[PDB]
Amino acid sequence: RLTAYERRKFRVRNRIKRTGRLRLSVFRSLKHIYAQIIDDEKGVTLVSASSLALKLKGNKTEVARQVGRALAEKALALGIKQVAFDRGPYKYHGRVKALAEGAREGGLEF
Amino acid sequence: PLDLALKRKYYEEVRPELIRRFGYQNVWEVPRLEKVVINQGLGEAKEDARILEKAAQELALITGQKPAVTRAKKSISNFKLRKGMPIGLRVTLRRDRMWIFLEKLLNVALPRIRDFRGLNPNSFDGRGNYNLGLREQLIFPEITYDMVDALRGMDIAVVTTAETDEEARALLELLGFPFRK
Amino acid sequence: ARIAGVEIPRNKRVDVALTYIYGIGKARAKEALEKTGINPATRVKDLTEAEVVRLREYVENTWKLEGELRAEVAANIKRLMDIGCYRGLRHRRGLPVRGQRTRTNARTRKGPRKTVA
Amino acid sequence: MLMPRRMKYRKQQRGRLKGATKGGDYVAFGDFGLVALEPAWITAQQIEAARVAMVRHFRRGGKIFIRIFPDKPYTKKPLEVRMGKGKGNVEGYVAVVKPGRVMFEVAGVTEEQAMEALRIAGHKLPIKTKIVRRDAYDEAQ
Amino acid sequence: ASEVRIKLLLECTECKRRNYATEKNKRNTPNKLELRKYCPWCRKHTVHREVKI
Amino acid sequence: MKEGIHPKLVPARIICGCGNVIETYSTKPEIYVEVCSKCHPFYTGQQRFVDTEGRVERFQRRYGDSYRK
RNA sequence: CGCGGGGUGGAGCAGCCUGGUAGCUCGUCGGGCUCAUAACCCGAAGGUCGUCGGUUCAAAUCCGGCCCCCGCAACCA
RNA sequence: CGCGGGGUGGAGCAGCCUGGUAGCUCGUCGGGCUCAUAACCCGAAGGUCGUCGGUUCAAAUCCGGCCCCCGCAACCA
RNA sequence: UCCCCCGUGCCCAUAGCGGCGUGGAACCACCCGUUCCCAUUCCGAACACGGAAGUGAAACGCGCCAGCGCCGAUGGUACUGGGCGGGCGACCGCCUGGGAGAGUAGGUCGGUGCGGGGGA
RNA sequence: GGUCGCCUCCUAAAAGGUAACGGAGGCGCCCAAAGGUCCCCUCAGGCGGGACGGAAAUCCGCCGGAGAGCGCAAGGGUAG
Ligand SMILES: [Mg+2]
Ligand SMILES: [Mg+2]
Ligand SMILES: [Mg+2]
Ligand SMILES: [Mg+2]
Ligand SMILES: [Mg+2]
Ligand SMILES: [Mg+2]
Ligand SMILES: [Mg+2]
Ligand SMILES: [Mg+2]
Ligand SMILES: [Mg+2]
Ligand SMILES: [Mg+2]
Ligand SMILES: [Mg+2]
Ligand SMILES: [Mg+2]
Ligand SMILES: [Mg+2]
Ligand SMILES: [Mg+2]
Ligand SMILES: [Mg+2]
Ligand SMILES: [Mg+2]
Ligand SMILES: [Mg+2]
Ligand SMILES: [Mg+2]
Ligand SMILES: [Mg+2]
Ligand SMILES: [Mg+2]
Ligand SMILES: [Mg+2]
Ligand SMILES: [Mg+2]
Ligand SMILES: [Mg+2]
Ligand SMILES: [Mg+2]
Ligand SMILES: [Mg+2]
Ligand SMILES: [Mg+2]
Ligand SMILES: [Mg+2]
Ligand SMILES: [Mg+2]
Ligand SMILES: [Mg+2]
Ligand SMILES: [Mg+2]
Ligand SMILES: [Mg+2]
Ligand SMILES: [Mg+2]
Ligand SMILES: [Mg+2]
Ligand SMILES: [Mg+2]
Ligand SMILES: [Mg+2]
Ligand SMILES: [Mg+2]
Ligand SMILES: [Mg+2]
Ligand SMILES: [Mg+2]
Ligand SMILES: [Mg+2]
Ligand SMILES: [Mg+2]
Ligand SMILES: [Mg+2]
Ligand SMILES: [Mg+2]
Ligand SMILES: [Mg+2]
Ligand SMILES: [Mg+2]
Ligand SMILES: [Mg+2]
Ligand SMILES: [Mg+2]
Ligand SMILES: [Mg+2]
Ligand SMILES: [Mg+2]
Ligand SMILES: [Mg+2]
Ligand SMILES: [Mg+2]
Ligand SMILES: [Mg+2]
Ligand SMILES: [Mg+2]
Ligand SMILES: [Mg+2]
Ligand SMILES: [Mg+2]
Ligand SMILES: [Mg+2]
Ligand SMILES: [Mg+2]
Ligand SMILES: [Mg+2]
Ligand SMILES: [Mg+2]
Ligand SMILES: [Mg+2]
Ligand SMILES: [Mg+2]
Ligand SMILES: [Mg+2]
Ligand SMILES: [Mg+2]
Ligand SMILES: [Mg+2]
Ligand SMILES: [Mg+2]
Ligand SMILES: [Mg+2]
Ligand SMILES: [Mg+2]
Ligand SMILES: [Mg+2]
Ligand SMILES: [Mg+2]
Ligand SMILES: [Mg+2]
Ligand SMILES: [Mg+2]
Ligand SMILES: [Mg+2]
Ligand SMILES: [Mg+2]
Ligand SMILES: [Mg+2]
Ligand SMILES: [Mg+2]
Ligand SMILES: [Mg+2]
Ligand SMILES: [Mg+2]
Ligand SMILES: [Mg+2]
Ligand SMILES: [Mg+2]
Ligand SMILES: [Mg+2]
Ligand SMILES: [Mg+2]
Ligand SMILES: [Mg+2]
Ligand SMILES: [Mg+2]
Ligand SMILES: [Mg+2]
Ligand SMILES: [Mg+2]
Ligand SMILES: [Mg+2]
Ligand SMILES: [Mg+2]
Ligand SMILES: [Mg+2]
Ligand SMILES: [Mg+2]
Ligand SMILES: [Mg+2]
Ligand SMILES: [Mg+2]
Ligand SMILES: [Mg+2]
Ligand SMILES: [Mg+2]
Ligand SMILES: [Mg+2]
Ligand SMILES: [Mg+2]
Ligand SMILES: [Mg+2]
Ligand SMILES: [Mg+2]
Ligand SMILES: [Mg+2]
Ligand SMILES: [Mg+2]
Ligand SMILES: [Mg+2]
Ligand SMILES: [Mg+2]
Ligand SMILES: [Zn+2]
Ligand SMILES: [Zn+2]
């Protein structure tokens, strides 16, 4: 048995995993949003940015933009520039979008 | 969100009675209406006229929502029925728009029907929900006789969080659902 | 749905339009009108709701009508068939109850003609 | 006359008859049974024939069990015709029996009665046979 | 194919060359076939239309 | 709500055949009805109405006893 | 054994190719004419399509097996 | 592929050359006569004149394209 | 470096179904609202956005129990690569190496990787 | 008499291949969406409840790993 939730997840995640790039995963809780970057070859998170960890607040979308930007800072430092965006079970829009838009001008190539 | 009549009777009268009747510990345990779905199972408009939109305008009138189509799943010969033929309407009432339909139903619709002698008690779902059938549809007040071509019934389904019929029986009886026996 | 449960014909007089209920005839029409001072020759449409509400709340209560009436008539007949009276047997066969000739006619009680070689 | 009610396929290849019986080697119902000593295609005619013989022997009484069933279609080309031009027609059904397979069983009839009845039955069968009594070994299986 | 599922060429409207050949159902889609397609001659894309095979 | 297909819903006044005013919301702001929730015979306690015992029947028929016991 | 045709109201034949819908003549039953019978006129009933399977939303109709009837074939020695 | 001519009411149909009328027979309906049956006779319903575009005061009648049925002749590696 | 939670892989049911219990500090979830972005062949159910009054009822996490499901030896046998023997014949049998399936004993209410948040 | 090319399954003896006038079936098409992509959705069936409404029309609830669907025969594949 499966929720449409889970089905979407696998469906969008698998497609990205095939392209073999680094993976920018995202979690979007009611109160926060989190974004880690994963090497699925080794199965390991290389760098992570989040609202909770940023001790951040001030409207979800505007917040989301920053965690992306912050994510790029720690990423580019390590050497990461090329990446693929795991949009999870979430429609590419609003909060998730803002995270991407931030992480974009933050320097990430995607 | 919007102050309405029936919602007040539930929240200020139905709720507590239920609590003292089954001794609910947690607040969300208390049974509540989830949604009300109207379904005019036509198919009388199968190959026939697209004048199911008359029944659709009549429908949207009663509910205050635009009704969606339902079309043939499989084709059936005995029914003169092609897979994909428009054969019904369905509209899902939630939140406040639900509360309004139920208020006008318990108060104005259900009495105005020919020889009303109570709702069927046995018609309970077995897992907390309830189903009934109308044949008229001028029975709703906002439908004068002049608007009607031919008669048309509909299938009302009312869905509650009630674990069982007992809890469901009570939630409905207390709201104003008149039962027959 | 207006009175007692089914909308009597508008545009036609009161005395007449009353008849169109399973329970009222010209007799109860002639009468029920008088007991609420309704103008006997006024069309249903011409009726003020003042006149309407009064003749509505009147008749519904005063007499057994329609479904409840018919169910009672039906329940009346069921009684006959159960005990086994002659009229009860005549209802069992569908034959003429009120003591008649069946050699000819009697076809209203038993419908269409069923010819045999 | 035994034969399948319905059949996925009408003609069936012949096959070999390797080994001992695959299973159905222990008495499972009555007190005595008839066991196959050598393998064969047991015809539906023979099954029925044995069946009748026992029935007849203890006229009215006891119950007969039949642990074999003819599901294999047996083919035969017509008389006096040559090889080739298709496979022959189905002309009957057999049950493939192998040594160790209990084929019949009886119950609720006296020991002597059972012995004669099962004995006569074997005489109808195209193979050597032995009668057996239900054992501690059978109930253990 | 058949009398009804027919063969046809796609002709570039810009320079009138036929650069592709395909099919269609005549009964189902009875109109000429309009389609953008690359033209090797014009070296761009072009609206091509159906042309009797 | 996907508007542009839905009928507006203004406050409604359904005064019935017993004067019983019930305000609510509906498509029509003015609508009338005969019998209602209040004045329906089934709803009101039980109401004899005109059904009392199905006529002077059966053993309770009276109108007899030609005896002086 | 081989090949082709056929089985549809009581009788005799259409409809199958192209799936949805059962027709014709006779007979039969009821009513007319006639003193009566027939001829004649009016009106009606009657099959669940050989039998099993299968395809299909749907089968007299398309596909496989079996049964009965019909025609053709069965030569070289 | 190249020619020739048709589509007109339910069936068949001259009207088309020569632009002003959707006409004829058969079919169905009603009425007359009838032993009846036909035939006869009076009336009547029934069409965008294949499509779409075009010359014209107006065209089934004349043009261009297109659909379709029949027809003519030739070709088929 | 032990404990709890969140995201995420790997092993692919010994991990599952079902039952009973536990958890809201934090996280997470239901939850609150429909102004805005977005959305419903009807419905803010879903998707989406702005929130934080309430609640762990649901969901989820963590436990516990073996009815189900799942896993499942050893021992023995079927069958068999190779080498042989007996019988007119049907078929049997021997050495050597390999060796199931079923069933019996029995196991199981998961185990682990990387990052994030919170603890003692 | 039947057959003649192509496809599916068995025969085929656990790689590939393998014969017979051996056992079963199909093809000579089709689709301007039945194609490309992006986004969303998940079956069949069972039980219960529901005016006309039935075994089966459309609606509600619970169950359900795939027994449905995938134009067409069969096989393989397939709801991550
Ligand atoms: Mg499952
Ligand atoms: Mg999904
Ligand atoms: Mg999916
Ligand atoms: Mg790994
Ligand atoms: Mg800030
Ligand atoms: Mg910016
Ligand atoms: Mg760059
Ligand atoms: Mg509101
Ligand atoms: Mg309360
Ligand atoms: Mg219908
Ligand atoms: Mg009344
Ligand atoms: Mg009766
Ligand atoms: Mg009479
Ligand atoms: Mg059987
Ligand atoms: Mg052998
Ligand atoms: Mg063996
Ligand atoms: Mg052996
Ligand atoms: Mg052996
Ligand atoms: Mg065996
Ligand atoms: Mg005995
Ligand atoms: Mg013997
Ligand atoms: Mg023994
Ligand atoms: Mg013993
Ligand atoms: Mg035992
Ligand atoms: Mg251009
Ligand atoms: Mg064309
Ligand atoms: Mg161009
Ligand atoms: Mg009141
Ligand atoms: Mg009361
Ligand atoms: Mg012939
Ligand atoms: Mg032929
Ligand atoms: Mg013939
Ligand atoms: Mg034949
Ligand atoms: Mg035949
Ligand atoms: Mg026939
Ligand atoms: Mg005949
Ligand atoms: Mg003939
Ligand atoms: Mg035929
Ligand atoms: Mg034919
Ligand atoms: Mg006669
Ligand atoms: Mg005569
Ligand atoms: Mg069938
Ligand atoms: Mg038929
Ligand atoms: Mg059949
Ligand atoms: Mg037939
Ligand atoms: Mg046949
Ligand atoms: Mg010769
Ligand atoms: Mg010679
Ligand atoms: Mg002619
Ligand atoms: Mg430690
Ligand atoms: Mg983990
Ligand atoms: Mg592992
Ligand atoms: Mg699992
Ligand atoms: Mg349990
Ligand atoms: Mg327990
Ligand atoms: Mg407990
Ligand atoms: Mg416990
Ligand atoms: Mg406890
Ligand atoms: Mg808190
Ligand atoms: Mg605001
Ligand atoms: Mg607005
Ligand atoms: Mg807006
Ligand atoms: Mg958009
Ligand atoms: Mg919008
Ligand atoms: Mg639609
Ligand atoms: Mg839409
Ligand atoms: Mg739990
Ligand atoms: Mg237990
Ligand atoms: Mg167990
Ligand atoms: Mg397994
Ligand atoms: Mg072992
Ligand atoms: Mg060993
Ligand atoms: Mg060996
Ligand atoms: Mg060996
Ligand atoms: Mg040897
Ligand atoms: Mg030897
Ligand atoms: Mg031996
Ligand atoms: Mg030796
Ligand atoms: Mg040796
Ligand atoms: Mg060994
Ligand atoms: Mg060995
Ligand atoms: Mg345990
Ligand atoms: Mg477990
Ligand atoms: Mg568990
Ligand atoms: Mg543990
Ligand atoms: Mg380790
Ligand atoms: Mg030949
Ligand atoms: Mg091989
Ligand atoms: Mg198509
Ligand atoms: Mg979508
Ligand atoms: Mg969708
Ligand atoms: Mg279902
Ligand atoms: Mg049901
Ligand atoms: Mg149903
Ligand atoms: Mg019906
Ligand atoms: Mg449904
Ligand atoms: Mg299956
Ligand atoms: Mg299906
Ligand atoms: Mg599947
Ligand atoms: Mg499948
Ligand atoms: Zn070009
Ligand atoms: Zn009132």
Side-chain angles (χ1 to χ4, degrees), chain A, chain B residues 1-53 55-181, chain C, chain D, chain E, chain F residues 1-37 39-50 52-54 56-69:
Chain A
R1 234 276 131 299
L2 277 167
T3 32
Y5 190 70
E6 301 151 336
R7 275 183 251 122
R8 293 198 312 265
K9 268 193 165 176
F10 284 146
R11 174 158 52 71
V12 51
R13 289 174 183 295
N14 290 348
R15 167 72 169 284
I16 303 167
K17 283 144 164 277
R18 273 293 281 180
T19 76
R21 249 120 154 293
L22 288 163
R23 176 171 147 236
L24 197 173
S25 203
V26 157
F27 185 41
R28 194 196 71 190
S29 81
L30 288 161
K31 283 168 73 223
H32 296 283
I33 180 172
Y34 315 63
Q36 54 172 348
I37 279 181
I38 311 166
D39 180 86
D40 277 328
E41 184 61 40
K42 309 182 190 316
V44 56
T45 304
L46 287 340
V47 56
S48 25
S50 42
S51 284
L52 154 61
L54 242 291
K55 304 301 171 188
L56 250 179
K57 235 296 298 165
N59 174 90
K60 287 171 187 180
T61 38
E62 287 156 344
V63 166
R65 183 118 49 213
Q66 283 185 339
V67 11
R69 223 133 45 191
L71 179 52
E73 276 197 59
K74 324 202 302 183
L76 300 188
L78 280 139
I80 304 173
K81 55 164 206 172
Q82 306 259 324
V83 89
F85 194 49
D86 165 88
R87 68 177 192 67
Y90 318 95
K91 159 174 190 177
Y92 181 88
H93 183 76
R95 285 172 71 194
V96 229
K97 184 174 187 178
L99 198 149
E101 295 178 331
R104 245 149 200 173
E105 85 238 14
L108 260 347
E109 260 130 299
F110 81 107
Chain B
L2 214 190
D3 189 279
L4 321 154
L6 229 195
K7 189 167 60 177
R8 281 223 204 176
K9 184 176 183 182
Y10 167 60
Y11 274 114
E12 287 198 89
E13 178 172 38
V14 173
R15 283 282 272 199
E17 245 301 336
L18 278 170
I19 305 179
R20 55 158 300 280
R21 219 125 95 169
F22 307 113
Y24 295 111
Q25 327 287 357
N26 202 317
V27 205
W28 293 87
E29 287 169 16
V30 177
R32 16 185 260 282
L33 298 174
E34 182 179 303
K35 62 186 169 72
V36 183
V37 226
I38 283 76
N39 162 77
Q40 297 208 270
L42 288 339
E44 297 121 22
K46 42 193 149 196
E47 172 89 348
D48 325 70
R50 201 176 203 291
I51 318 171
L52 68 304
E53 51 193 63
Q57 54 105 7
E58 285 178 26
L59 228 216
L61 222 284
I62 302 179
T63 57
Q65 288 189 18
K66 139 127 191 186
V69 217
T70 47
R71 331 179 70 92
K73 237 140 56 178
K74 64 173 184 157
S75 196
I76 289 115
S77 167
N78 288 19
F79 291 178
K80 207 160 189 62
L81 218 204
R82 201 64 31 162
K83 160 185 178 186
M85 271 177 164
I87 52 166
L89 303 175
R90 186 263 337 272
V91 57
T92 295
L93 306 172
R94 289 187 226 255
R95 309 234 201 188
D96 287 39
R97 278 195 287 343
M98 154 183 62
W99 283 113
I100 297 303
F101 174 82
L102 275 175
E103 171 179 4
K104 311 188 305 77
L105 180 90
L106 299 167
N107 278 9
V108 156
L110 282 183
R112 239 179 79 194
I113 89 179
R114 241 119 304 181
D115 298 310
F116 186 99
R117 357 237 62 173
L119 303 195
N120 191 310
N122 310 97
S123 284
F124 268 100
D125 204 80
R127 262 164 288 217
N129 325 291
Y130 188 84
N131 299 273
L132 65 149
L134 288 328
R135 348 91 283 175
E136 305 283 4
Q137 84 276 20
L138 50 77
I139 249 49
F140 296 84
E142 324 109 272
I143 312 303
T144 166
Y145 166 64
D146 294 337
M147 289 162 171
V148 182
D149 313 321
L151 299 192
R152 245 167 293 105
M154 71 188 77
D155 292 290
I156 299 190
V158 298
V159 185
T160 84
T161 59
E163 291 271 37
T164 191
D165 299 336
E166 287 64 308
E167 314 170 55
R169 222 294 197 180
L171 171 68
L172 294 192
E173 208 180 55
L174 290 186
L175 276 179
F177 286 74
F179 289 95
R180 185 168 67 252
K181 292 299 171 178
Chain C
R2 174 158 61 22
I3 164 206
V6 213
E7 178 132 307
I8 52 188
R10 325 104 71 92
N11 322 322
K12 289 172 74 64
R13 285 173 68 177
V14 277
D15 37 21
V16 174
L18 261 320
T19 311
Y20 287 65
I21 320 175
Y22 205 114
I24 309 184
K26 44 82 54 188
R28 294 193 175 183
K30 169 187 304 171
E31 189 270 345
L33 294 183
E34 290 191 358
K35 300 307 166 307
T36 34
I38 322 288
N39 216 322
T42 38
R43 301 294 164 174
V44 173
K45 52 180 183 185
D46 299 336
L47 263 41
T48 75
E49 93 142 26
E51 305 175 273
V52 171
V53 167
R54 294 189 285 99
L55 190 48
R56 196 204 290 94
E57 69 177 29
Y58 182 104
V59 187
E60 279 178 298
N61 297 262
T62 310
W63 300 301
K64 286 181 183 62
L65 291 157
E66 215 59 35
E68 185 244 13
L69 214 189
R70 287 183 298 198
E72 184 152 341
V73 185
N76 211 120
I77 292 191
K78 168 74 173 184
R79 246 196 64 262
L80 297 191
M81 286 181 62
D82 278 334
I83 47 163
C85 51
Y86 182 75
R87 313 149 47 199
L89 279 344
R90 282 297 223 199
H91 273 299
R92 292 233 232 187
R93 291 164 277 163
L95 287 186
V97 178
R98 305 281 238 264
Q100 289 111 318
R101 278 184 74 272
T102 37
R103 181 162 184 164
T104 335
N105 308 309
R107 312 241 87 265
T108 49
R109 283 298 301 173
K110 52 185 184 179
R113 294 187 178 249
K114 311 150 193 166
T115 307
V116 270
Chain D
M1 204 53 52
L2 296 312
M3 80 169 203
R5 300 188 253 179
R6 277 156 49 204
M7 305 221 60
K8 207 171 174 49
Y9 296 103
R10 193 188 38 180
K11 320 219 189 173
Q12 194 184 116
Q13 296 169 323
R14 292 189 173 72
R16 244 208 178 270
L17 302 84
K18 315 163 37 202
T21 196
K22 189 173 151 201
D25 62 308
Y26 55 82
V27 179
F29 299 97
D31 325 277
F32 314 85
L34 196 63
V35 190
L37 295 180
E38 27 194 54
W41 294 350
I42 307 289
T43 87
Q45 290 54 91
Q46 296 158 356
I47 293 189
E48 178 59 19
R51 212 258 302 175
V52 172
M54 287 169 271
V55 163
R56 185 100 51 184
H57 175 263
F58 38 68
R59 345 171 193 84
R60 190 203 144 68
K63 174 173 180 182
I64 301 184
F65 300 82
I66 303 166
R67 307 277 301 294
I68 66 175
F69 185 93
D71 54 346
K72 197 171 206 294
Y74 178 81
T75 257
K76 177 120 220 164
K77 273 207 148 312
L79 226 218
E80 291 170 18
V81 333
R82 320 181 105 150
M83 310 292 104
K85 298 92 188 189
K87 185 167 153 64
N89 303 110
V90 185
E91 296 258 283
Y93 295 88
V94 292
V96 175
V97 82
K98 252 118 66 73
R101 181 109 190 189
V102 187
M103 315 160 73
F104 304 92
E105 283 173 46
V106 263
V109 111
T110 59
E111 184 156 334
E112 66 281 8
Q113 213 171 1
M115 291 302 266
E116 188 66 74
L118 279 187
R119 176 187 83 79
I120 295 167
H123 274 260
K124 311 305 188 193
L125 307 181
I127 49 179
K128 299 179 98 51
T129 45
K130 81 195 171 195
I131 314 178
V132 287
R133 168 192 315 263
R134 210 191 51 244
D135 270 349
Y137 299 98
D138 289 278
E139 301 188 54
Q141 237 69 7
Chain E
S2 49
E3 328 269 308
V4 43
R5 183 132 213 103
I6 66 180
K7 313 185 196 175
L8 57 88
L9 313 159
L10 289 177
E11 181 179 276
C12 144
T13 331
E14 299 225 11
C15 73
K16 300 296 165 301
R17 272 69 179 253
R18 302 91 130 87
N19 299 328
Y20 305 92
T22 182
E23 31 165 305
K24 100 175 182 197
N25 193 294
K26 209 170 55 172
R27 180 176 285 133
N28 298 351
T29 33
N31 291 94
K32 308 302 171 182
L33 254 188
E34 287 247 311
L35 281 171
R36 282 223 314 156
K37 276 300 185 148
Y38 182 97
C39 183
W41 292 90
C42 298
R43 274 177 57 72
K44 50 176 295 186
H45 274 69
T46 294
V47 43
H48 291 47
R49 70 188 62 222
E50 180 186 316
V51 131
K52 189 185 171 187
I53 183 60
Chain F
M1 193 180 61
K2 186 192 276 189
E3 31 61 28
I5 38 169
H6 303 267
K8 320 166 188 180
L9 291 180
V10 263
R13 197 180 320 275
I14 317 182
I15 309 182
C16 295
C18 192
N20 196 268
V21 192
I22 302 187
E23 185 155 36
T24 172
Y25 298 93
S26 176
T27 36
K28 281 180 177 56
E30 251 277 284
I31 28 190
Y32 272 5
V33 162
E34 349 297 311
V35 197
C36 186
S37 194
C39 55
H40 193 273
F42 177 82
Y43 281 68
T44 74
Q46 58 110 62
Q47 171 82 104
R48 302 257 55 99
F49 206 62
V50 68
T52 302
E53 216 211 20
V56 59
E57 285 183 280
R58 186 51 182 173
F59 81 96
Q60 286 133 344
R61 79 295 191 280
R62 274 300 93 251
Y63 312 151
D65 193 81
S66 191
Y67 314 102
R68 292 182 176 172
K69 283 162 291 183

